[PDB]
Each structure stands twice: as C-alpha cells, then as structure tokens.
Amino acid sequence: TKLEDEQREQLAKEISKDWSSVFERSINTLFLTEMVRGLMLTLKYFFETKVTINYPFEKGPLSPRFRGEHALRRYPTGEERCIACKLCEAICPAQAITIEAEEREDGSRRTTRYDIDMTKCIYCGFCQEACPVDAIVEGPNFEFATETHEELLYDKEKLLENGDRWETEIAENLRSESLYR
Amino acid sequence: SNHTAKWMQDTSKKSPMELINEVPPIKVEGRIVACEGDTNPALGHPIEFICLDLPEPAVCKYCGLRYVQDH
Amino acid sequence: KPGEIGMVSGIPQEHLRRRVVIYSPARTASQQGSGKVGRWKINFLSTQKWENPLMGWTSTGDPYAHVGDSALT
Amino acid sequence: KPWEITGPCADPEYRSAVPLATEYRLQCPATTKEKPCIPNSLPETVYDIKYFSRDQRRNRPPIRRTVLKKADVEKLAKEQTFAVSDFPPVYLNSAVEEDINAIGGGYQG
Amino acid sequence: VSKAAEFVISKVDDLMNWARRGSIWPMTFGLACCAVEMMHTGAARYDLDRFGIIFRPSPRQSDCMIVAGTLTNKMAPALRKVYDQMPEPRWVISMGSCANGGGYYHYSYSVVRGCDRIVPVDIYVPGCPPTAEALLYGLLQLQKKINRRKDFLHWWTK
Amino acid sequence: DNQFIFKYSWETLPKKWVKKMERSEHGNRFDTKTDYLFQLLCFLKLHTYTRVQVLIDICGVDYPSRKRRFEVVYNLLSTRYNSRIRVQTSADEVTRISSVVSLFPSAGWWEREVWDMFGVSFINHPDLRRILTDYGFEGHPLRKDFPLSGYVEVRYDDPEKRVVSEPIEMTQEFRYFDFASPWEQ
Amino acid sequence: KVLPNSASVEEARQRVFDFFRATCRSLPSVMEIYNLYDVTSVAQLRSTVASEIRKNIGVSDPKVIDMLLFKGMEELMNVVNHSKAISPFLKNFYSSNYF
Amino acid sequence: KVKASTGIVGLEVVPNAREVLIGLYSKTLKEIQKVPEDEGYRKAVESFTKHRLSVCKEEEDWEAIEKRLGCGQVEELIEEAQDELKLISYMIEWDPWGVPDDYECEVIENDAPVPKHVPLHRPPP
Amino acid sequence: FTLNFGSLRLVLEMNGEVVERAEPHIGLLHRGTEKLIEYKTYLQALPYFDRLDYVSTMAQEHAYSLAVERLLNCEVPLRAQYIRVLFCEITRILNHLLALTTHAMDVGASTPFLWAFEEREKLLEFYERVSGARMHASFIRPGGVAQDLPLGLCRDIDSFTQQFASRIDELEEMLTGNRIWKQRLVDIGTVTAQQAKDWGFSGVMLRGPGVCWDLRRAAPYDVYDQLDFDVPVGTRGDCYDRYCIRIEEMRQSMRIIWQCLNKIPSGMIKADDRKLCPPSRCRMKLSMESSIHHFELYTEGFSVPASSTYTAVEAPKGEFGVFLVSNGSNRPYRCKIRAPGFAHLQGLDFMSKHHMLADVVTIIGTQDIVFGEVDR
Amino acid sequence: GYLRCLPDGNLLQTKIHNIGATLVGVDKFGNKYYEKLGDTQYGRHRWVEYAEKSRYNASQVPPEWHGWLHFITDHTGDELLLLKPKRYGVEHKENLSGEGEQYIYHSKGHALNPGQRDWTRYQPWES
Amino acid sequence: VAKKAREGVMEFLLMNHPLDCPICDQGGECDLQDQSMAFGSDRGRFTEVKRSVVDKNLGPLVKTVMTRCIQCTRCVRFATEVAGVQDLGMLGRGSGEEIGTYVEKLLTSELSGNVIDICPVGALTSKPFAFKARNWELKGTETIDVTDA
Ligand code: SF4
Ligand code: SF4
Ligand code: SF4
Ligand code: SF4
Ligand code: SF4
Ligand SMILES: [Zn+2]
C-alpha cells in the first residue's frame, strides 16, 4: 500500500500545479457541473419528440423474409401444394412437425396427416427453405397468441386455412424473396 | 373420399381433389410438356416432363394438371 | 466384477436388469452400399409405444427407446 | 435552449436520433425499384463442371503415423541443439497512449 | 335476478374489470432468451407503461407472472414458490416456446416441458422469440380475457 | 499455425510422458498418461519459452468402444507466444486423475463440469460437487449410454404442494432419423 | 476435500467407517429437515444405512469402493440440503404384458 | 530515466531490474548445473540463460537490454526467471529425466489443409 | 453469516457488510445443449449456437461456422466474409450496448437504457430485414451465409452509423465524468493481469488489466487483417476502465462497420460447392443434380472428415470457443462450448472479495454474465 | 367515434395523429388506413383506425393490408385484393381464442371437437 | 481418370433423370442419390428437354414410374434367372427404350416382390407402401418370418 500512497501523492502533486487549477477543480467539484450538464441533456430529451410506437394502431416495420406463423399453401388451381416428401421433419431441428401420408384416390401423393407444434417450433424457417414446392411457408402473421396449449397444437386443416387466409400476402412476400434467391 | 375425410373434417367446402378434377385438361400440340406449377418457374415445383402417347390424360404428379396431346 | 460399473454409474436399478440384444445391423436391401455395415448396436427391446389420445403421437415410457440405435455405436 | 450551452448538443456536428420517414427507408424491402441478380457460381465453373479437382472436402493427404522408439529418441536428442535464433519468437505488444482524434482526424472511420 | 339489479351488477363488474385491466402489474420471470425481447417490449418503442403495465420486482405486489425463457428442473421449484406468493387475483403469460411446451429443448433432461406443468398458465405467446409486438399482443389478450370477469355477478348468484 | 513452442516443447520436454503427439492445422495435440499430466502442465505453465499460463478449458469425450472410455482434453493458450496447445489423457469411470486447480485456478469449475457430465473424479479438487444438473441428479448426462431425455421428469403434485420428480412418461417420443449414407465411407 | 484412490483394502475399510460415522452424525439434522418423527425410528434409519453398506459388500475393487463412498457423501450432502397369494408372476400378468 | 508504468496492472516497475536479472540468471545457472547434461531441457536453459545474462551484463540501461533482447518488459523477464527457478526446483523434486526403456511414442502428422479464413494464430514478425 | 439470493442464485459470506466470499449456483439454466447437438445434425445444431450467449447472437454462429469450415476445409467467398464481419460487428455493438445499459440500471442510472434500446431496435430491424427474425437469426452458415443482403441495407446502416456515433458521444457524456458513476465504478473488482490469466479471463475482462491481447489481431479469422481498427486496453483493470474499453470497442465496431460497407465486394454469398452448401431454389427446381444435392443436404448433412479441433472467436463477451470432435458421420460426435462467462463467474469469487453488495452487483454487471452461455 | 376518447386515451392519440394525415384507403371490414409523410418520424407514418372503437383488436387487420401496415410492402390493400386468388380461399377471421369453444380451434382428438376421431392404427375383430 | 469417368457417367445418368425425388419413394435409399453425392459432380450442365415415359401397370404390388428407370437391365435378367418367368424385358433402341411387357401382362411370381428391391432408382416400388413413409423414419428390427417353413 506504500506504492499506492506514493502514487496518490504524485498524482496530487501533478494535478495541483497552480492555484488556478486547484481553484477550478474545487469549484467544479463543489458546484456540480457534470450534474448540471446531465440535467440539461435530460431536459433536452424531455422536450424532444418521442419514439413510442402506439401499438394497436401503429405497428413496427417488418420484412418479407419474416418468420411468423407456419402455414400451408395451395396451387392456383386449388390442389394442395404439399407433396408428402417429408423434408419438413427431416430438417426441423426441434422435431415440431409430424407427417403421415398415403396414396390418394386418383393416385396422387398427398399427406393424410400434417401437424406442427407451435409450442415446439423455434420459428427458424428451415422447413420453408427445404420445401421443394414452396408448400409450407412461415407466414407474416405473428399475433396468434392462444389461451390453450391444445389450441397452439396445429394440424393440417388449420395450416391450410391459414394459408388460404394469408395467401395474397404470402404470395407477395414469396415473390419478393424468390427474387432474393 | 376416405383420404380426404381422414385429413379434413369440414365437409362443407370443396376439397382439393374436387377442384383439381374440375380444372379441365390442358391441350398441347407437342408430344412432351414441361410442367412447372404456375407462370413463374421459380415459384412452382421442380420441372416435370410428361409423355403423352397414351390416349388418356396424364397427371403431372406435381400440381396434377392432366395435359393431353392435341391430335 | 461384471456389474460394479453399472451399479455405480447412477442408472436406476430397475433399468440395470433387462435383456438386451447385441447385433450388427445388416446391409439395407434397398441399396448395395457397404459403408454402414460392420458396426455393432445394443438393441434395448423397448416396444411400449402407444397413441396419444389428443394428437395421435407415438408416446413412450422407456428411457432406452432410441439411445441404443442413436448414440450407442 | 439551455442544452446548447455545453455538451453534445452544442456540437455543430450533432445528429438527431429520430430518422425521418421521407429519408430513412425509402423503398419497402418487398417492393424494390430494381430487380436483384445474385450470382451463385463463378463463370468458369458453369460449363466446365469438374468436381474431383475442387473437392476440397475429400482431397486431403492421408494421416501419417511414426512409432519412435528409445533408439530414435536418443538419436534425436543427441542430434538436436539450441541456438539463440531457434527459440520461439515472442508475441510482444504494448500500449501507445494515442489520442482519439489521431486516426484520420476522428472522421474517416 | 331482476333486470335493474342485473344492470347494476353489470356496471359494477365493468368497473372492476376496467380497473384490473388498466392496472396490470406483471412480474418478469426472465430466464433464457425471451427476457431480452421482454426488455425490448418494456423499452421506448413498444412501451408497456402506457397500458398500465409496470414490472413489480416483489411477487407479493405483482398481478400476473410472465414466464419468459426456459424452465429447468433446477428452477421449477423456485418458479412454483414465487408463484405461490402472488395474490389470489393472478394470471400467467407463458412467453416463447420453451415455457409453452419445452421449445427447442423439448427432448432434453432437466428441461420442464412447458411451464403449464408447474403453474396454471392463462395465455401462451408463441414465437422464438416472440416479437415485442407479439408479446404486447399477448398482454392485450390478457386484458381482453380479464375484461369478461363477472366476479360480482358470480358472487351474487351463489 | 504458430507451431513454434510445440516443437520447442517436444525438443525440451522430458520424453517419459509424451505418449503421442499430433502435428495438425486443426490444433497441435499432446496425449500423455494421467500420472504425469500435472507435471507436464506445470512444466508448460512455468517454462519461459512455452508459457501457456492461461487454461482455455477442460473437456470430456465419451468413447464406449475403448477400454478407457473417457478422454479428458485440456485446451491451453500462450498469449506471450500466441499459440494454442492441447493436452489430453484417457480415464475410465472409477480411476481418479490428478487435478490442476493449483496450477490454473480456473480449472475448478471445468473439472466440476467434467465430473457432472461424465463421472471422471479428480484427486486434489478443493470440492467436487455437481455444478450444472439438478440437485440430487443420479446419472452422468454426457455419457453416450445416457438417454437423451433422461430418466426422470418433474411436475407439480397438488396433494404434496410441491414439485415432485417422477420417471419419464413423455409423449411424442424422440424420432431418431437414420440419414447415414452407405457410400459415405 | 477429495482424496486419492485407496491403495489397500484396509484404507478402503477406514474410509467406509469414516463415511458411516459422517452419516450417523448427520442423521439428527435430517430429523429437523424432513420431520417424519412419527415413524422415523432413527435406530431403524441407522439399521437401514448399515444394511445398504452390508448389501454393498460384493464389490472388491478399491476404486469402486472409493467411487461409491464419494457418491454416498454426495447423497448425504443432498439430503442435508433437502433434495428428496397369487404369486408374483400372476400379478404382473394381470397388470401388463411387459414384465 | 525511470519507467513510469509497465502497462500491466499486476506488474510493478523495479528500479534495480538489471541487478535482479543478473542475480536470477546466476542462480538459474547454478541450479541447472544439477540437471543431467544429456537432457535437452538443461541445454535449452543454459543456452537462453547464458544469452540473457550476457546481454544484460553488456548493456547497462534497461531500455537498452529490452531493445537488444527483443522481449521487452524487464519485469516480465524477472517473472519468467522466477518461474524458471520454480520449474527447476520442481524438476529436482521429482525426477523425470531418462527414457523408461522399451518406450514408444506415436508421432502423428497430417497435412490436411484449412481455408485462409479460419482463426489461425499468425506467427509474430 | 450466510446470505442467500435467488436466474442468478448467489450465497455470500458477510462479516460487517463486507463480502468475505461469494459462491454462485449456476445450473438453473442447464438445458442439455451439448447432448442435443450430439443428437442433431450440424445445420440443426446451428440454432443451438444462436441460443447460446443470446445477447450476442451471430458471434456464436460465426464461431460454429468457422469450426465446421476448419474441420471441412471449404473456402468462403469474400462477399460472405465481409457481410459476416459486418454483422459480427453489429452484434458486438448490440451486446456492448445491452451490457452497458443493464450495468447502468443495476448501478441506478435508468435513462440510458431506453436510448440504447432504441439503437438496439434499429439494429434488430437490420437483423430482421437481412434474415428471418430480430433475434436468433440463423443467418451465418458453414460455407457462407443464408441469403444475400436486401437492397438499401447498406444505406440504412450508414445512416445508423452516423446517428450512432452521435448516440455514443451522448451516452459517454451522460455516464462518463459523473461523480456518482465514478464512485460506483473506480477501484471496484480490480483484477491483475496475472489473476486474469490464471482465471482464464478473455475479451474486455482480460484487456482491462492491460494484457494487450486481442483475438481479432492474434488470430484474424476474417478480413480483420484488412480493417486497421483499434484495440483499447486498460491501465489498471477495474469496472471504470472496462466500461471505457467497452465504449471504445463500440466506436471501433462502428469504424469496422463503415470499412466493411465501403469495401464490400460483389459476388456470391456462400461456398461454391453444392456438396457442402445447398443450391438455390431455381437451381434445385431446374437441375437434376441440384435437386439431388438439395434433398441430400436437407435430409442428411455434409459428412465432415473425422477430426477434432478447437475454434475460438472474439465474441463481445470475450473468447467464445467451440471444440468439435467428429467421427466422419453427419452428426457431431462431441461439441464442447467454452463461453466467456463461465470463467468470469469463477472470477466473481475473488473479484467481489472485501467488497459490498452493491459492489457485487456492479461486478456482475461489468462481467456481463449471460446465463445461457454459462449453462451451455 | 369521439366520445370513446375520454375513457380510451389511445384512440385519443390516434385522433391527434389523424390531424394532417391522408386517408390512403379503407377495407371491407371498415378499417380506415391512413398515411402521413413529411415531418413525421419513420415508425409512425402509417396506421389504421379499426372503426370498432369498443373492442378494437390487433388481429382485425386483413392480410391484404397487413403488409402495407407493417411496412413490408408499398402495395396498398386494394392491389392485393385485386390479386386475391380464386377457386379457393377463406375470409379473414380474427384471433378469437377465448370467445367460445364453438369458435376456437380444436384438434381431431380433443373431447371438445364436434367430431372426435379415435387413434389406434389397428382394426379390432369387432364380432 | 477413374474419378472423371465416374463423374461423366453420373452426369449422363442424371441428364435424363426426372426431377421428382421428393415424390419418389426412394428418398435416402436411392443408389442414384447416394452415388451422385459421393462420386458425381455437384452441378448439372443439362438444361434442354428431358425424356418422358408413360407408366406401366405391373400388378397390385409393383408401382412403376418408368421415367426414373436408368435401364440397367437388373430386373430384366432377374426375371430371367432368379424368378424363372420371362415377362419383363428391355424393348426399344437408343436413348428412348422402354422396359416391361409389350402386351398388358401383370407380372406374377412368388419372387416378384424382389424386383422392386433390386431396382437402384425408384422406378419399381412397393405399391402397398406407395407413399406411406420414408426410410429414415422407419426403425428396422432383424427378425424371421412365420408364413412359410
Ligand atoms: S420454422 Fe423451423 S422449427 Fe418451425 S416447423 Fe419449420 S423447421 Fe421446424
Ligand atoms: S417440404 Fe414442402 S412438400 Fe415436403 S412435406 Fe414439407 S410442406 Fe410438404
Ligand atoms: S422460446 Fe426461443 S427465444 Fe424464448 S427462451 Fe426459448 S429458445 Fe430463447
Ligand atoms: S432414385 Fe432418382 S428420382 Fe428417386 S430420389 Fe434418387 S436420384 Fe431422385
Ligand atoms: S432395375 Fe430399375 S433401373 Fe434397372 S432396368 Fe429395372 S426398372 Fe430400370
Ligand atoms: Zn406440375
């Protein structure tokens, strides 16, 4: 601690070169100059405009490559866009997708069961980029909070109706992002 | 039928099978076609080439559209 | 002694006395590649899978359902 | 205004936090005035596909193993010697105490 | 049971629901990586103080517990103990995927498969992480859910 | 790169404990015996031209096929000479290996973590309580034979008014997908 | 504090005795920790601990003995820190197929 | 002149750095005289200790000895010398010298290339 | 006497309000990340690194991708390297802002929190425009990146850099030079360089003492050796000097961001070989081989050669390292995750010795312990 | 709806913001979409008045206007309505999720489902 | 030389293979996919018109997608040698040559199930297992059969 004491003495000698400097330092420490400056900046921000978003009527900016709510699309004709290739759950890191399928009546390969857990999905977009036919897409919707876990457990019919409801916005985002691909 | 009722329970709207059966076959002059899904190849499905020697319409196996040779 | 490591490994005692099958998985009949042969697996005969009443998933109650086929090579 | 007396507000080169809607983000990302074109391969590797030469994953030399015995260890020990220039170099660095406005006048970035 | 007493009871219930909706005092249970997004929700942009939400550090003064993050077997007893100290008018918002059904660590030791197994959660907020927009949507959904509480009518008709 | 102090070590280090050495661009590797690991790390830390005075970390790897399944790896760094080194040994379930808490004080928590995850006990640790898993954890999670989902799970038991631990009964069992290609070898 | 592996059966026996002493001295703390005074029977608890030690006699490796003592001391610390006629065949048969 | 600060907070400037280094190097040589001559550790220790002792004897100013040695921070040099004394004491306390006979060491060398953008500790100039 | 605090659990031995010793209990956020990574493919394991050290998201992606490329030997294009550097520096700015403002709130200063969150919201908007989500954006992949930059992003980042230079000046004016702030920070939790080396400190906590060692300069893993930035060091390692170092690191991160924006090249965004990087949607829908390779890369993974390596990067917290051991299969055999919070929280014991409770919380804030990475 | 401002205070903020705004559109549900450029910060130059002052919800924005409101697209809802697909599609429905068991979504195996389906994957003998 | 030969042969095999792996039932168990990812190149120089073949009806067990057939004649000589019934055959000449029966002849044999097993590509597949599941999902237990002795 002797080294600390002598360092303190040397520093005190260094910053006490003359009466002008010592008086200036004492006045600055006594009259709260830094506190006054902080108060002035605080007052400036009190009088400046705010950045509050006003949630329900004004909503934050997004991007077409947004990972919101998982959903299933359809072809323009009306048939399901999803063949049963099972690339969803092969790549789904959280294993939130379960799919079962069989040959349809007309020989087409379609999924007879397709459910996604929204409590297990990590909203990562691996399925929507692993889809060979752009069938599953993570839609722009994100305000789908549910009161029950069973409600949050989706299935094929709910995914298809979500895709039908959000088809136009999903199509616009898909065009804009297929440009970026 | 059984498959549609197995994955869907609404039984009030039209199932995709009925819509895809209602869309008419597409008449093409050539012997082979290129099936892409929609007007934008990048937004459809992988390209599928379909042979049309058989008289009956041929399902695309992707976005099944039943292309038929002209003559 | 044959079993001291198991009895001190922390595995529950109820799972330390169960018949297992040691076998080398044969080559798949679908394809002729021979890079997945020669490995040996412990086959914990855990077949107690049922259907979830709510969503129809494959539930289980045996901790050794997939470890022998996934991690233990 | 009292806040221009001293502090960052008194600085002429002071920038407001809020960005104007007419100058921050002119075009929405899904509607851009110009169409992108992102390359995915070199022009050389388009019609000249040849993977056994650019197979960087598998084109590696085999691992070499050598079992040195007591005789080899003694031979290397006797053969080897240490000089002032064979010692490992030291990664030395030190503080400079340089002003913040020294690099490019504080502007260039 | 009448039509004027019913109207008075409805007005009293509306006043009570308005008070409880406008004075929600949630408490953060900020584990893992929904808590950072929660702090973003509490920030200047999507401000929570406008709607009456202020975070009370003491569970005894809080209204609803917002569990954001992963629930661990080592921490679930603490979560339950803290929940038990909350007053009887109480609600739970499970934010993210970890607190809903285990999320990205569902098949993992020492991970509770959702906070629903420990405490009765009222509203789930899907996302990973849910946008601050979505979390504020969930809080507004909690306000809507507690906007249909006929406590006075239920007490009267017993 | 920077394979200077590695070669200098192999030139100056006693040859008694150098079981094997690996010269790689993925990291220079020393593999020794558990008896002489403490002495080897003391030599490296204190020598003036191999000053690996900071212990990056201690890791464990499980190899069920080998007789000594556990592999204890030590990643060390030399800031004075700017290079990373790796020193590893092999230990089994029962045998206790020497602790390097005295040399590197940071090694305490990594050694406790290794104990927690694998079961490799250390000889001179000031304490060796579990650090990461739940209180009263029975197994060692990072062992290969340890199931991914564990053996027990917790839930709230209303009659007991506490969170109890019960054997696992999880729904939606883990689906192991065998993606391995027979032509990968 | 953790000690090196015991090199002798006598040393392992001494360590076992020390661990049993520790359990016996820490038994009355468990009384106030758990509060099962009605049917605890502290003597019966000591008998059960002795019975566990006696059923762990088939082990002869000093390393295994030391590891068992280490895990037993860990369990003791955890408990101190409060962390919790139709033949056998026919009953299992009536219960389920997997037995 | 005198070094105002060594930059390192733990290290403290020493006035008699040259004398301390001379004494430490002399004691290093005296202690390493006990190590067997065949060992490479003793040869390397004698080499660098003699070189450092020679340069610190020839050059008087600590700035000059730092500049000529190229390691800098005579305080760091003193710390290294003290650690060398401790290591020599340890290798006298336990005897690692001599191959154990019937000894085999597996030298492994692979030339697997790595991309130029991975973190590799570049050699000092 | 022992005083208990209960995801940060901490037991302190006190005599006269003076902290004799502090012992943290950390396992409260253990999630089996290493076990799950062993059980999952490399691409499926990238989100785990997204989740680790969640305040600094893309730094962990960068470390994991660098380790995979080291074990895989695949060349990353210059444009991908530059955008990775740009977003790593954006990540560093985000982490430093959050650390400084949470530390200020723990001290008692409440107002800079929301200004720095406005800045962080701008940066998270950058993340959401370039990739999927604001947080945990799996954008950095082995061999390159997921997608190219949307147009206008560079201009928006330039505007942010100017306004953020103004904001850093603003925050430094409010916090630095305050008598209360100085009394809270100076001579609190001081660490010698020898102590830091012994306890394995890294990053600001190691440069605070003045070891004068940075990973981006010792082992440049990017265009860092072409960006001529500055690395600040502390004269006497304490909370005040570490805070000043963090401010200077924010300034140098802005400098690096401007340099990357200026000299970003035009080219591809990922590794050229489709055996290791997935082909584009048009290529997989048009080409037979591309469809095969997309299918195989999204069912199976790239089979890295059997090897073990340790790859470390200069994460904003400190040195974040990943130790990957493979066996030639599509899944990582072993993945050890060395986070620069595990060592610092050990350092808490000796740092907060003979201090008080407010000094303990100040030391915790200065070390910036994110419990996800310490419970990896 | 101006009397709701006194007990709402949030509709009051919206009405204050609709002083110099221009009504860029209106949807079929009654929501009136406003834009206001000029001297306005970036984050508050597009918004909506839900035309349901009592119980306005954040999920009442149709997908046609969702992107424009969230600044994803410069395309107003009219163009997306013009581009709406045919031969399939459903009308926009709010996130009720608590307004009734007959309104919320139920799984095929849930007891509350109007038709509950068994899941055993085998057909018994069924004498 | 060998690597270039393998790459060229893989390119020629894949120049007319249909881009229908996702609907192909041989996903993860297709020799064309694995050998293309192991020995073939990562790109495709072909962008012209492919060839297409109409499907054949070969019974209630073998579903045939003849666009995927690589004409390896492994099943033509299987029916000749092992099965013992000569119905399958390679008929045609050139780039477009079809395989099956000239007349509508459902293949019928006790060993007819092995025809789908030896097909490397997903040309011949089990009809009852048409699109039920992939390979990685299924766990395989090594057992014996009790239908025969
Ligand atoms: S977004 Fe990711 S986590 Fe969600 S379903 Fe798709 S692959 Fe799974
Ligand atoms: S990847 Fe696409 S086509 Fe395949 S199962 Fe998923 S949604 Fe269906
Ligand atoms: S739900 Fe996702 S964002 Fe939230 S704590 Fe879990 S991993 Fe993090
Ligand atoms: S067999 Fe051909 S069509 Fe089927 S997945 Fe393999 S490469 Fe594709
Ligand atoms: S085995 Fe398959 S690929 Fe070979 S000739 Fe027969 S149908 Fe064609
Ligand atoms: Zn089609």
Automatic annotation (TrEMBL), chain B:
Signal sequence residues: none
Disulfide bonds: C35-C60
Residues in Zinc finger CHCC-type domain copies: 30-67
Gene Ontology cellular component annotations, sorted alphabetically: mitochondrion
Annotated positions binding Zn(2+): C35, H45, C60, Y62, C63
Keyword set, alphabetical order: Metal-binding, Zinc
Gene Ontology BP annotations: mitochondrial electron transport, NADH to ubiquinone
Record flagged with keyword Zinc: yes
Protein name, UniProt field: NADH dehydrogenase [ubiquinone] iron-sulfur protein 6, mitochondrial
Region of the whole protein represented: 31 to 101 of 103
Automatic annotation (TrEMBL), chain D:
Name recorded for this polypeptide: Uncharacterized protein LOC106768957
UniProt gene name: LOC106768957
TrEMBL record, chain J:
Compartment(s): Mitochondrion inner membrane
Membrane topology field: Peripheral membrane protein
Domain of life: Eukaryota
Gene Ontology cellular component terms for the protein in this record: mitochondrial inner membrane; respiratory chain complex I
Primary location recorded for the protein, binned into one broad class: mitochondrion
Keywords: Electron transport, Membrane, Mitochondrion, Mitochondrion inner membrane, Respiratory chain, Transport
One GO term of the biological process aspect: response to oxidative stress
Family according to the record: Belongs to the complex I NDUFA12 subunit family.
Function (record text): Accessory subunit of the mitochondrial membrane respiratory chain NADH dehydrogenase (Complex I), that is believed not to be involved in catalysis. Complex I functions in the transfer of electrons from NADH to the respiratory chain. The immediate electron acceptor for the enzyme is believed to be ubiquinone.
Protein name (record): NADH dehydrogenase [ubiquinone] 1 alpha subcomplex subunit 12
Organism whose genome encodes this protein: Vigna radiata var. radiata (Mung bean)
Range within the parent protein: 28 to 154 of 156
From TrEMBL, chain K:
Source superkingdom: Eukaryota
Function of the molecule: Core subunit of the mitochondrial membrane respiratory chain NADH dehydrogenase (Complex I) that is believed to belong to the minimal assembly required for catalysis. Complex I functions in the transfer of electrons from NADH to the respiratory chain. The immediate electron acceptor for the enzyme is believed to be ubiquinone. This is the largest subunit of complex I and it is a component of the iron-sulfur (IP) fragment of the enzyme. It may form part of the active site crevice where NADH is oxidized.
Residues reported to bind [4Fe-4S] cluster 2: C69, C72, C75, C119
Record-given protein name: NADH dehydrogenase [ubiquinone] iron-sulfur protein 1, mitochondrial
Organism: Vigna radiata var. radiata (Mung bean)
Domain 4Fe-4S His(Cys)3-ligated-type: 1-40
Subcellular location: Mitochondrion inner membrane
Residues reported in the UniProt entry to bind [4Fe-4S] cluster 1: H17, C21, C24, C30
Family that this chain belongs to: Belongs to the complex I 75 kDa subunit family.
Full-protein interval shown: 151 to 299 of 746
